[PDB]
Symmetry: D3
Subunit: 104 residues, 6 copies
């Protein structure tokens, strides 16, 4: 039964990762990147082990795709630290920009 | 226009990775793991950059999921080397088991 | 980065279009067609350019499928005007039936 | 038009069935199985005929997959009765565990 | 590891079931229904246990959807026997119509 | 029953449209655009009415997405004529470049 739960946690983790980027686009707040990268990872990790796995799979692929197209080396490191913070169960609101609406 | 090719190459790379594991199940040949972990990576990489990205995203996730459930540390390293060989465009038949049918 | 945002806006636009028809079925209000056709298009357009594109792709296909099966010519024109109203950022509540619940 | 509505009801029924198991994992309440099996089926059936069809397709497949892996015969019968109760429009809260949060 | 094979066998079984109906539409041979309802079940079952499960899940849903729309009771029984024959690994060409092309 | 064939023809038409662009990337032949924009439309239309509908839905969306990103007005017209030729069941090899391999 644990395998089927792990997969459900993974798809749910995938949806929470998607929700973070969907919200990032909606907010349109400059310098919110770190907050949503931590939140999607935090939410996915909260689903369980499948969520942790899905968040890491999605974060690594995103980082690699941006790298290929022209995303700066130092800029990728900041994205990497924000993902790890959330995934480790630490508070995403740590990277929260001051004027971001309560919904996010 | 290079962005859509990249995505098409990625989905195609994803299908070639799927095809490798689908074939691995069909063959039912003991030792295969490596050859196939490397055929899928070779075929996906051949699609273009999107295929390389998709093969790596899929290989890393597979390795991590196997690790969580109970796959041995040394056993994962062999799977890792096999994936890299194929993805780098080197010949997969290098890891080919002697009694494997021509179709694979 | 704009291409990846355009695709996210498109999938989100696709979900908002789906949500409009899902809600239309739930409400079961006679003569609500115009309201939900405008709302799904309005919501999708609000996501951004990807949403505008997805709303138009979905609206054109829906109109063409109904035409093939037996939907009246004049009946299609009313569906067409309602989609355009919403997509152009104009208020969907313009086509709102008087006894429709607040949730919709 | 009824066929397209039946399919929309089915996908929506599929989502309500998924939502029940996603919620079951979130709650982590022991002996909640019956409640969520009835709720997902009740919610899906409420969508319409497509929802009834999708709930039954999903419930039968779930029951068969668990049977193959090692789920007890008597244990499957309890899962079967809970699915039927909900699908028939009877109150899921009938199987509600006393300390389960209001959201579920 | 038997869990992932089961899922891969299921998706592959799902594709073989799809392929049977896709081919049924292509052939446009009157009487086919049975042979094809049984070729798809045979191919899916050949994938392994996941394929058997997927063929049965797909066959039961198809039978139920056809029943709701207006498919005759006696007509459903013939479809039921044809599915079982294939799924049990028996030769599908048993129900083969005389003038059906070699590709099918 | 004509409704399910229509949907199956549509998904199959969608796959044939995908196959055309997947092949276009593989070939890497300069000028192809048209032949392929017309092979996919021909193959999809051959599936039946669902295929015709899916080819048109896909062709219109592709044309609109290309327009938004920076595709020239005159360049879009050539893509439009090529799609119509194929979809109308006329021979795609009409736009075939002289040095294109036999597989395509």
């Amino acid at each position: 039964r644990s395998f089927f739960s792990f997969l459900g946690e993974a798809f749910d983790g995938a949806r929470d990762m998607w929700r973070a980027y969907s919200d990032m686009r909606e907010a349109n707040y400059i310098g919110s990147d770190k907050y949503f990268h931590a939140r999607g990872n935090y939410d996915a990790a909260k689903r369980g082990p499948g969520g942790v796995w899905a968040a890491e799979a999605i974060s690594d692929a995103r980082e690699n795709i941006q790298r290929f197209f022209g995303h700066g080396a130092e800029d990728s490191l900041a994205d990497q630290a924000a993902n790890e913070w959330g995934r480790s169960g630490k508070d995403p609101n740590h990277f929260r920009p001051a004027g971001l609406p309560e919904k996010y």
